[PDB]
Every structure is written in C-alpha cells, then in structure tokens.
C-alpha cells in the first residue's frame, strides 16, 4: 500500500484556516470556574465533567493545545473516510442510511466536500467537556464556524443546500441518528474509529452496553471481518505515525474484564483472536503532527494502506 | 490474590490484596509502587470508570481480573 496525497490544494487551504483559527487556539472554557461535581451541580459555570482534562501538553517547551481534539485527530479522520469510501465500493449490500443512501452513492466531489466538513467537526470545542450540553454546544459552534467560512469562501464549491446538509452533519442535532445521512454516517464512522486510541478493550471490541455493538464489531458488520480489521490496523498505524500511544490488543484477556461470557463469546465470534502489542506515545512525532498541516499531512500520506484501497 | 492493572498500551503492574479493599485503597496501592497520585488515576472495569468508595467485591473483581488505568493529565 502507501496512501499518498489525497487532499487537493483547496482542502489543505481549508485545513490551514481551521488550524490557524480554531485548532491551534487554547481551550477557553477552562479553570476553576469550569470545575464540576455531581453533588454541587451549579457551583460553577460547568454542568458536567471534563472542562480541565488534557487542556495542553508540553513538548520541547511548546504547549500543544487541545491534544486529544487537535490537528492530528482531525486530519486522521480525513484519511479514514477516504479508506472507507473505497471499502464501501467493495460491499455488495452497503448499509442504507435513513435518507435511503449509502456511502457508495457519494461521488469523489461529495467526498471532497465531506472532507472539508470533517475539518470543522471538533473545531467548535472549547474544552474536553464530555457531557451532552457541552458536546451539543461545541458541535453547534463548529457548525457555525463551517458555515461562516463556507458562505464567504466556498460558494463556488458548495451549494446552499450542501452548506445546510454539511452544517447539520457537524451540528449533530438532538434527534438525528448516527446514520441520518450517508454523509453524516461517514463523518461519524471516521470519528468513531479514532476513539480506539483512548478507549478500553471493552468499548472497542465488546460494546459499552448490551445495545451497542462496539467499534471494531461495527467496522466488521459494515465492511466484513477482513476489510474491517484492515481498517482497524490502518487506524492504529495512523496513531503511531502521529506519535499517539497505540493500545495493545489481547482477545484472550477479554473474559477477564468483568463482562458476561455471553458478550465476550459474541465479540470472539465476530472479531476472532487478536494479539497485538501496544506502543508508547512519541513526543517528537506528536509535535510534528500537531503544530502544522504540512507536518501532519506528510506523516499521514506515507503510511501503507491495505492493497484493496488501491485496486480497481 | 493477584489481579493485573494495565495502561491502554499494556504496561502491567501485578498487585496483591483482597476483595475487602476499596478502589481508593487499590489506587493508594498503585501510588506506593509507581508513585502516581490517586486523583490522576482513573481505574476502569467493564468499560466503566470506577468510583473510589466502592469495594472490589461490588464490581466483582476477582482472581486475575484486568483493571485498566489511564492517567488524567490535567492540562499540564
Ligand atoms: C477516547 C475517549 S475521548 O477522547 O473521547 O474522551 C471522552 C471521555 O474522556 C473521559 O474519560 C477518560 C478517562 C478515563 N479515566 N480517566 N479519564 C470521559 O469519560 C469522557 O467522556
């Protein structure tokens, strides 16, 4: 494999704007006035946890702000959607979204516009706050930032209809389903994949609830086990390329994580056995990927894809 | 008895003690080995973060269970 440069100059320019304007900036909903405890819900401005988590990390004396939802995270999702676009073309019966459409019904032009929307997806964030109000406020912020940029500078590219749809994709409005639109689905799948870098084996392989399938099981239902595992591996190699910690995987350990043998066996039958070693975060590559679009882009383009990415 | 505590990357520390201990207890134990303050420690089990007060018996932690440990780096 070896993906090479997939983003045209227009997309990179937009990445450059989003980095300058949003992703390079300090989180602002931080400090004592944004602490939270369930037992004193209205003691501060926060109505939930997470405002002061992981605001920045120090590398070679330089603060990298918003390391969990910064440039690298965002750029990674563009690479995921590219891979899954091809993956979808290999499926005889792709997943039908609530709009009646599938990933394979997107054109290359659609993919470009989708990628541009992905750049703003977490751009509205003002902290690592996790709870619903914060999540919804921050996605609305990212949606509005997208719209303000698109209406000034991209009207030769997006129709008004398309500005509305992509805005809604970013907004993630309450009542809208994960698979509301094919565009939305692909955006969310891409975000989902990236969570593997910071979740436990339970969320990734087993499901955080009897209802929810789990990240890798989800990739497998959509894409088959072979392509789904390849996608999984690809994402782990993007973690390592951008200097992020790669979690280990051990399917033999799954029965020892306090989950009902029921669900452990289920995941085993879907995923099969996996033993792969994790890897410590690398500060130098973290800096390379976090402080400029070229740094991040040049690290991602290099990484090998599955061979089917490249096939006709 | 023996349980394992692991970072997401697989760095594993093996612990001795008992169902009787609380999670705050086990976090203090991790402190004494590796020197990590409990306030920075999130222990996971069944993909859900554990609260300091409850015992290992409550989350049914037994022989050779794996708990996961992430370090809350507050923004520093
Ligand atoms: C990969 C998870 S994330 O980056 O989306 O973070 C969201 C999540 O982070 C917090 O948990 C992390 C953790 C576990 N133990 N100590 N910190 C919250 O659960 C939040 O929803």
Numbering used by the authors:
A (entry chain A): -1 to 310
B (entry chain B): 1 to 76
What does the paper say about this structure?
Effectors belonging to the SidE-family are involved in noncanonical serine phosphoribosyl ubiquitination of host substrate proteins contributing to the formation of a Legionella-containing vacuole that is crucial in the onset of Legionnaires’ disease. In addition deconjugation of PR-ubiquitination from the host cells proteins by deubiquitinases for phosphoribosyl ubiquitination (Dups) has been identified to control PR-ubiquitination levels. These Dups (DupA and DupB, also named LaiE and LaiF) consist of a single PDE-like domain and perform their action by directly cleaving the phosphomonoester linkage, restoring the native host protein and concomitantly releasing phosphoribosyl ubiquitin (UbPR).
To covalently trap the two members of the Legionella Dup family, we prepared a set of probes that carry a reactive group substituting the phosphodiester group that in a bonafide substrate links the serine substrate protein to PR-Ub. Gratifyingly, the vinyl sulfonate probe 5 quickly reacted and reached full conversion even after shorter incubation times of only 15 min. In order to pinpoint the exact site of covalent modification, we performed mutational analysis, where we mutated His67 or His189 and unexpectedly observed a retained reactivity of both mutants to probe 5. Although Cys196 is not part of the catalytic triad and is placed slightly outside of the active site, we wondered whether this cysteine might react with probe 5, as the vinyl sulfonate warhead is a Michael acceptor that could also react with cysteine. Indeed, despite some minor residual labeling activity, reacting probe 5 with the Cys196Ala mutant significantly reduced the formation of the DupA–probe complex. The most likely reason for this movement is found at the binding site, where the reactive warhead has inserted itself toward active site His67, but is caught and bound by Cys196 before fully reaching the target. This creates some steric repulsion because of the local strain in the sulfonate probe when ubiquitin would try and nest itself in the actual binding site, so instead, it now binds loop, albeit with some flexibility. The found density nevertheless further confirms our MS-MS data and mutational analyses and shows that the vinylsulfonate probe binds Cys196 of DupA.
